[PDB]
Enzyme design. Structure first.
Site, PDB file in Angstrom:
ATOM      1  N   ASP B  13      23.376  42.444  27.305  1.00 54.95           N
ATOM      2  CA  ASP B  13      22.719  41.192  27.660  1.00 54.95           C
ATOM      3  C   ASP B  13      23.565  39.933  27.543  1.00 54.95           C
ATOM      4  O   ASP B  13      23.013  38.838  27.555  1.00 54.95           O
ATOM      5  CB  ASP B  13      21.456  40.997  26.820  1.00 54.95           C
ATOM      6  CG  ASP B  13      20.429  42.096  27.026  1.00 54.95           C
ATOM      7  OD1 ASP B  13      20.215  42.519  28.186  1.00 54.95           O
ATOM      8  OD2 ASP B  13      19.820  42.522  26.021  1.00 54.95           O
ATOM      9  N   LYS B  16      28.121  39.997  31.546  1.00 56.76           N
ATOM     10  CA  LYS B  16      29.419  40.458  32.027  1.00 56.76           C
ATOM     11  C   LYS B  16      29.414  40.507  33.551  1.00 56.76           C
ATOM     12  O   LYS B  16      30.391  40.115  34.188  1.00 56.76           O
ATOM     13  CB  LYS B  16      29.733  41.863  31.512  1.00 56.76           C
ATOM     14  CG  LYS B  16      29.957  41.997  30.024  1.00 56.76           C
ATOM     15  CD  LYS B  16      30.355  43.430  29.707  1.00 56.76           C
ATOM     16  CE  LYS B  16      29.275  44.410  30.139  1.00 56.76           C
ATOM     17  NZ  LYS B  16      29.659  45.837  29.920  1.00 56.76           N
ATOM     18  N   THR B  17      28.327  41.015  34.130  1.00 53.45           N
ATOM     19  CA  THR B  17      28.210  41.127  35.579  1.00 53.45           C
ATOM     20  C   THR B  17      28.069  39.751  36.211  1.00 53.45           C
ATOM     21  O   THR B  17      28.551  39.513  37.321  1.00 53.45           O
ATOM     22  CB  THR B  17      27.018  42.024  35.989  1.00 53.45           C
ATOM     23  OG1 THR B  17      27.264  43.367  35.558  1.00 53.45           O
ATOM     24  CG2 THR B  17      26.843  42.031  37.490  1.00 53.45           C
ATOM     25  N   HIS B  54      31.925  53.758  25.882  1.00 50.94           N
ATOM     26  CA  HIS B  54      33.171  54.098  25.222  1.00 50.94           C
ATOM     27  C   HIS B  54      33.736  55.388  25.788  1.00 50.94           C
ATOM     28  O   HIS B  54      34.845  55.405  26.303  1.00 50.94           O
ATOM     29  CB  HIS B  54      32.941  54.244  23.722  1.00 50.94           C
ATOM     30  CG  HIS B  54      34.188  54.498  22.938  1.00 50.94           C
ATOM     31  ND1 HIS B  54      34.902  55.676  23.032  1.00 50.94           N
ATOM     32  CD2 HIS B  54      34.849  53.728  22.045  1.00 50.94           C
ATOM     33  CE1 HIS B  54      35.950  55.618  22.228  1.00 50.94           C
ATOM     34  NE2 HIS B  54      35.939  54.446  21.617  1.00 50.94           N
TER      35      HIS B  54
END
EC number: 3.6.5.3
Lengths: 282, 363, 363, 282
Positions: B13, B16-17, B54
């Site tokens: 949240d 990043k996008t 990851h």
């Protein structure tokens, strides 16, 4: 009381809440960090309620054996980064210990017991966290196998040493049988499956005689493939687990296999298109 | 035009996008205009990916689809670091991302610079804990939403980030610039002049007259480049990318074989043992149908040839299933020229069942 | 007593089982004595299998499950050879069965001896047509039903057959009589004496002072046995079947390796290319789940080590499924001591997915 | 005429029948070879009738294409030695040609047409021989693949070359699909199979909501496993047969796969026991 950067920092230091969440809580508490902590405590549930809408398909599976009693647990979260996180790990381990200590196999009670903690944890991490399921297995000999935090399995046996039970647990983790022995598959399931395999042969244009004879054969295998003893041992496919057991005068009395996110539809995110949707603004 | 691969690492949240969208939109209007995105500055072209997982990133990085040159840690100043931020930075450390720039998002909602100060202190300290130059790390105080809203005050912050991508992350080293190396494929003789080893120049330049070393499989050897010839045209030098055929001096054919490598004397040493990050293909990806155990003895394909190897799985690991990422210490049956970062494939009976990367040479 | 492996091949309704019942019965009544039967004559012990199918037999031979020293072709005098009798002889030829003895069954039901002449000539010409000595082949005219009925006249014919099994099929060469051969497993250095190589004597006898050759993988070397030992006790000699360590003269530790072979000088040669009969296991036998094609390059386990090789499939053959029998021309990446008859295993990543037998050495 | 060994040889080397069958037929035909050949026809039907009860699970699968019409056929015998026999090959090939020539898909008609010849062959081979089944595949482009005499496959395609069609026929031979496209599987069978899976999941102890979501996921692979285009190309498992076709702008219209013995017992014999069963008295 004036809310200095140090006051906010102090609140945050002891709450793990967000910079601005702490700041605003102090604004309401008017500097009284003590009230702030309580208010924020009440706020945790709302923050957790918002996140409850988000799909939690990641997480870990944990197993714990205490004598003839074992528990297998699934605790979810959104990303594996949190699944790796100490706060999450600690919570998951604590749920496990309680589950084993109190012989808790009903998720409703276990969820109830950890609701406040879960809420506090979610408020800090900002990801939906959920105690999904829990189960126990009892037996003379109990063994477990973790394939990372991804898969967990409990195996109960008789006349089997630790190494055997570990191997059967590894096999279950890999081969997913749903019955112990072929003869455990109800005549009902066999019949249903017969009909299915029959309809498939028929539509293939196969002559009724040849079609039925074939299906008759394919069915004889069916029970073996869905059963532990009927499945080829993963560590040596030339023998079935059934033979492996007989060679050791052992018997499996039960097993359970959990895999993180089973049943949950994880979405296949497309970054490129997601960004494009954001690029609408200019 | 230089090519830099970057990626975003952050909380789900934290935007990043959104920031990535602000990057394209702002760079486009200002300068001229696993799935990834692309954008350009007047100096470089960027391939931008996201690191949502990851294990996921590790898998791509191993399969040859990642190799970040710099990472952008997106932390929304509205919250500051999350507990999982340690894991975001830790991944950066584990895959060895060379540079990390921080983008403090949602700064428009922090009603106090003093609070922005605090958030920064925390970020820089976390970075240092994982051995990143926390106090030297570029930290841009921006806002993706406002920038996307055309708020020229914030768009400036986006370009500031782009500036750091340009400055903080240095231009990736060019292959031509790397010392000469050629993965040997076929070795044949002409008689009329000499022995010829065929291959594509991996890196650098080989000029006629230059001396070279034959590394791998056998004891290293030295020889002299008595001519460089390409397909249907003789030249004076083989350069990076060029598929050539290198003619040597006085070296018998049975002394050079596929798998060996031509390289600038001293630039590459042979090894047998190494620690590696490995990824095993799932059945659906065309790999194994079943798992393998401790005694697995596959072939490791380095550049041009298979070298059988013995595997040392981690302690407590006795089964590797299709689709798994796993660390393994391998012991090849004979040396192979290798450096850390060298990619390899794992094959069974000639078919690739996995991919890997040399993490640390041991012997 | 000498052990001999025999098998019956003939038409389904020609009395192969009846004949076998008769052989066991009469020999016991006379001398008092894979699903096979066993019987003894005053001179030898026999292991008798049946060969109902061509592919089944080839598979069993390849998987070691059965390999005949002599075959008894059973043809009923009433019919004479069947059209498929040539398919029977042809398999005998294909799997290199050394001798074929014929037993004409139901002779008691043929009226004219001139007709028996016909049947025998047909069998003799069929045999000759596939390179078997039709002219010398022993053709016993019997009746298994009558011999089994205690009819002395016909029981004698059973004894006549057993007699040919004793005289026609050469007493197999005992391993201990063959030229010495030891498959090397581990090599040790010592100082005080020399290098020791361990393994199980396959055949022959190795004695102190005798010269031996180190064959396979590398260029052959010659050395002298300085001493033999088992369980650290210096023995007099090393006999076939025993596990020993052979001490060598002037041979350095690194001059020998696993997979190489010790042997009486001039009795074994290393080879790279050969033709073979191969059987690929099915999923249910622990083998592959999917078919392999032209570019399959597994490892060929010869005695104590794997040797990668490429394959050439018969013309028209482009795919091999688990469970298939197939002839193939293998080309090893390096030579290994071998000769026609040498069995081997086919492996992938260390697991056996098939088995084969060196049929014809090419290079 | 006098029946001499020389005369018997004349009829045997002309018929391939048993020495004694020739002798008896000539004697009764009084030396007339042509009549003796006719006698043997009558007596042959009785010999074939005798062998008619033996299981013929071995044999060959034959395939022949003729433009837009393809035929696949199965002719059985008792042993492979006979399946590899030229006379048997000659018989099966003749049955195959006739089926293509006359477009005969009704095995009864084919059987009726070759009954006399089949009886003659059986009378000289001494094994039960039976024309078991035959089918035709029609399409724009037809291809075939014989994996030995054992497996035979016919494929109909659109926009696919000889090599692609051949490769698909190779895939069908190996992977045994039963539908062309995943959508070809009826909702009736998908549902039936869903129930079977659900029943197995439920008994496995899985809580309903999880068991249902899990079965739901398994249905997608179910249809992909049974369909040609949903299966992994044998020559390159990293792609499905549908992807291979798309990248070729080709399409599969149909396919037929026959394998020797399908739907037949596969008895199994115990030589040693049979020998012992005969070692009675003397």
């Amino acid at each position: 009381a004036e809310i200095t950067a140090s006051l906010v920092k102090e609140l945050r230091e002891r709450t793990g809440a967000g910079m601005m969440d702490c700041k605003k809580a102090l604004t309401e508490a008017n500097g009284d960090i003590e009230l702030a902590i309580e208010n924020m405590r009440k706020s945790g549930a709302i923050k957790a309620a918002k996140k409850a809408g988000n799909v939690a398909a990641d997480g870990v599976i944990k197993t714990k054996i205490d004598g003839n009693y074992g528990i297998i647990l699934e605790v979810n979260c959104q990303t594996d980064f949190v699944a790796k996180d100490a706060g999450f790990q600690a919570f998951a381990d604590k749920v496990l210990d309680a589950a084993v200590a109190g012989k808790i196999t009903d998720v409703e009670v276990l969820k109830a017991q950890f609701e406040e903690e879960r809420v506090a944890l979610v408020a800090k991490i900002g990801e939906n966290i959920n105690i999904r399921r829990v189960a126990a297995l009892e037996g003379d000999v109990l063994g477990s196998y973790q394939h990372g935090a991804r898969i967990g399995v409990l195996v109960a046996a008789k006349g089997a040493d630790e190494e055997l039970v570990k191997h059967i647990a590894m096999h279950v983790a890999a081969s997913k049988p749903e019955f112990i022995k072929p003869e455990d598959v109800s005549a009902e399931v066999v019949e249903k499956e017969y009909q299915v395999q029959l309809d498939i042969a028929m539509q293939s244009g196969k002559p009724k005689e040849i079609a039925e004879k074939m299906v008759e054969g394919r069915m004889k295998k069916f029970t073996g493939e869905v059963s532990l003893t009927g499945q080829p041992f993963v560590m040596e496919p030339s023998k079935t687990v059934g033979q492996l057991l007989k060679e050791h005068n052992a018997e499996v009395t039960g097993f359970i296999r959990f895999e993180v996110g089973e049943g949950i539809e994880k979405v296949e995110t497309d970054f490129a298109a997601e960004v494009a949707a954001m690029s609408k603004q200019s | 035009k230089p090519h830099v691969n970057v990626g975003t690492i952050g909380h789900v949240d934290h935007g990043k996008t959104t920031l990535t969208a602000a990057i394209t939109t702002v760079l486009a209007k200002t300068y001229g205009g696993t799935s990834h995105v692309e954008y350009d500055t007047p100096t470089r072209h960027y391939a931008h990916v996201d690191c949502p997982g990851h294990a996921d990133y590790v898998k791509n990085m191993i399969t040859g689809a990642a190799q970040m040159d710099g990472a952008i840690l997106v932390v929304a100043a509205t919250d500051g670091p999350m507990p999982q931020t340690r894991e975001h930075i830790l991944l950066g450390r584990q895959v060895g991302v060379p540079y990390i720039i921080v983008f403090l998002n949602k700064c428009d909602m922090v009603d106090d610079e003093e609070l922005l100060e605090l958030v920064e202190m925390e970020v820089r300290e976390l970075l240092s804990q994982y051995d990143f130059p926390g106090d030297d790390t570029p930290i841009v105080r921006g806002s993706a939403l406002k920038a996307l809203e055309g708020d020229a005050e914030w768009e400036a912050k986006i370009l500031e980030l782009a500036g750091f991508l340009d400055s903080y992350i240095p231009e990736p080293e060019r292959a031509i610039d790397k010392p000469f190396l050629l993965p040997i494929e076929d070795v044949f003789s002409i008689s009329g002049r000499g022995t010829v080893v065929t291959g594509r120049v991996e890196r650098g330049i080989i000029k006629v007259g230059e001396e070279v070393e034959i590394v791998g499989i056998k004891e290293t050897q030295k020889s002299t480049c008595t001519g460089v010839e390409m397909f249907r045209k003789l030249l004076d030098e083989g350069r990076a990318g060029e598929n050539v055929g290198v003619l040597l001096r006085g070296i018998k054919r049975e002394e050079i074989e596929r798998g060996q490598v031509l390289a600038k004397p001293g630039t590459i040493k042979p090894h047998t043992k190494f620690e590696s990050e490995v990824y095993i293909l799932s059945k659906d990806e065309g790999g194994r149908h079943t798992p393998f155990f401790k005694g697995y003895r596959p072939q490791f394909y380095f550049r041009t040839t298979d070298v059988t190897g013995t595997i040392e799985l981690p302690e407590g690991v006795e089964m590797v299933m299709p689709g798994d990422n796993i660390k393994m210490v391998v012991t090849l049956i004979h040396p192979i020229a290798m450096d850390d970062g060298l990619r390899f494939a794992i094959r069974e009976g000639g078919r690739t069942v996995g991919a890997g990367v040399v993490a640390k040479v041991l012997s």
